[PDB]
A paper describes a structure:
Lenvatinib is an orally administered, multi‐targeted TKI that selectively inhibits VEGFR1–3, fibroblast growth factor receptor (FGFR) 1–4, PDGFR α, RET, and KIT 3, 7. Lenvatinib is an inhibitor of multiple tyrosine kinases including VEGFRs and FGFRs 3, 7. Activation of the FGF signaling pathways is associated with HCC progression, and proliferation of subsets of HCC is dependent on FGF signaling pathways 17, 19, 20, 21, 23, 26. In particular, the potent activity against FGFR1–4 is a distinctive feature of lenvatinib, compared with sorafenib.
Lenvatinib binds to the receptor tyrosine kinase VEGFR2 with Type V binding mode 28; this may contribute to its high affinity and its selectivity for a small number of receptor tyrosine kinases. Co‐crystal analysis with lenvatinib–FGFR1 complex revealed that lenvatinib also bound to FGFR1 with Type V binding mode. Homology modeling and docking simulation based on the lenvatinib–FGFR1 complex suggest that the mode of binding to FGFR2, 3, and 4 is identical to that to FGFR1. In addition to kinase profile, the binding mode with target kinases differs between the two drugs: lenvatinib binds to VEGFR2 in a Type V binding mode, whereas sorafenib has a Type II binding mode 28, 30. Here, we discovered that lenvatinib also binds to FGFR1 in a Type V binding mode, and homology modeling and docking simulations suggest that the mode of binding to FGFR2, FGFR3, and FGFR4 is identical to that to FGFR1. Thus, these differences in molecular characteristics of lenvatinib and sorafenib may underlie the differences in the pharmacological activities and mechanisms of action of these drugs. Lenvatinib inhibited the basic FGF (bFGF)‐stimulated phosphorylation of FRS2 in SNU‐449 cells, which express high levels of FGFR1, although lenvatinib did not show potent antiproliferative activity against the cells. Long‐term exposure to sorafenib confers sorafenib resistance on HCC cells with upregulation of FGFR1 37. Considering this result, lenvatinib has the potential to overcome such resistance by blocking FGFRs. We previously revealed that lenvatinib targets VEGF‐ and FGF‐induced angiogenesis 7, 8, 11, and therefore the blocking of not only VEGFR but also FGFR by lenvatinib might be behind its potent anti‐angiogenic and antitumor activities in the HCC models.
Numbering used by the authors: 463 to 578, 593 to 647, 650 to 762
The structure:
């Protein structure tokens, strides 16, 4: 275990004041932290940051995984609407990967806590637009998410949506095994991805369809009370979820377009961004 230094991102450990943990192990031992002078221009400023690290009893393969994650972020590059890499502590101690902090939790929790401040109809659509922008970027950089969901969209102090866990490789996951927090991850998967193991930017758009439904149900659980075996039957039968209560016909049509049985007929993020752009413009 000897990691190579990268002076682009390298940060001294003495510049990193660690803090309370974040988000229930959902992202693999993350903590709140305070980085003293990330920006070498203003070196006397603290910045609130998130810091992922390896677990108490992590394996040699877990380290391999965490490095790939770090390098992935390096390559993909910066965008407002994704979790950006800020730095890392690689030398003379455990690996710390420092990323942008998102004060107001994930999107599911964010929406649930703000059920009836209010979110204007505009806020919700604005929020959906932002995720589409973030996904357009990732798509432009050949990056397939594979698990796009409100659970993996974080929200900042400034209410900016930041996509997380995009990329994060692996290779036949168990459909039946749940998120121990209380979630069945297969319900976001497109049929081609679910059945045939074929992940594409189109399969992500299917998931974005489900994410839209999540938004306009203020953190609603999709296919509630439907076990795995039943979900298979439903998707096979061409079943699609009902329109949310607070959700226009235009937006529901967008969901349905995202849930088009034929992958190539689904709209691209590029298109979704443009449509959402226009729709945000006309909303209270
Ligand atoms: C308070 O809520 C959170 C804020 C967070 N802010 C930043 C990063 C977080 O966690 C993450 C979330 C994701 C990643 N990693 C990636 O996004 N990696 C990308 C390349 C695959 C990392 Cl390091 C840390 C946060 C998690 C929570 C929370 N309640 O769970």
């Amino acid at each position: 275990y000897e990691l190579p230094e990268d002076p682009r991102w390298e940060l001294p450990r003495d510049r990193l004041v660690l803090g309370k943990p974040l988000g229930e192990g959902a992202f693999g031992q993350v903590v709140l932290a305070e980085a003293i002078g990330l920006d070498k221009d203003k070196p006397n400023r603290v910045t609130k940051v998130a810091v992922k690290m390896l677990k108490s009893d992590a394996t040699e393969k877990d380290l391999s995984d965490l490095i790939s994650e770090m390098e992935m972020m390096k390559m993909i590059g910066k965008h407002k609407n994704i979790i950006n890499l800020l730095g890392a502590c690689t030398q003379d101690g455990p690996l710390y990967v420092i990323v942008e902090y998102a004060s107001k939790g994930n999107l599911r929790e964010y929406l649930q806590a703000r059920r009836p401040e209010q979110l204007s109809s505009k806020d919700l659509v604005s929020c959906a637009y932002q995720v589409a922008r973030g996904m357009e970027y990732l798509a432009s950089k050949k990056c397939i998410h594979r698990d796009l969901a409100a659970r993996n969209v974080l929200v900042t102090e400034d209410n900016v949506m930041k996509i997380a866990d995009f990329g994060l490789a692996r290779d036949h996951i168990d459909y039946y095994k749940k998120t121990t927090n209380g979630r069945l991850p297969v319900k976001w998967m497109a049929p081609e991805a679910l059945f045939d193991r074929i992940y594409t930017h189109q399969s992500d758009v299917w998931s974005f369809g489900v994410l839209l439904w999540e938004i306009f149900t203020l953190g609603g659980s999709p296919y509630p009370g439907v076990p795995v075996e039943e979900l298979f039957k439903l998707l096979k039968e061409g079943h699609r979820m009902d329109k949310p209560s607070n959700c226009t016909n235009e937006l529901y049509m967008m969901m349905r377009d995202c849930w088009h049985a034929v992958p190539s007929q689904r709209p691209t993020f590029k298109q979704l961004v443009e449509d959402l752009d226009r729709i945000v413009a006309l909303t209270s």
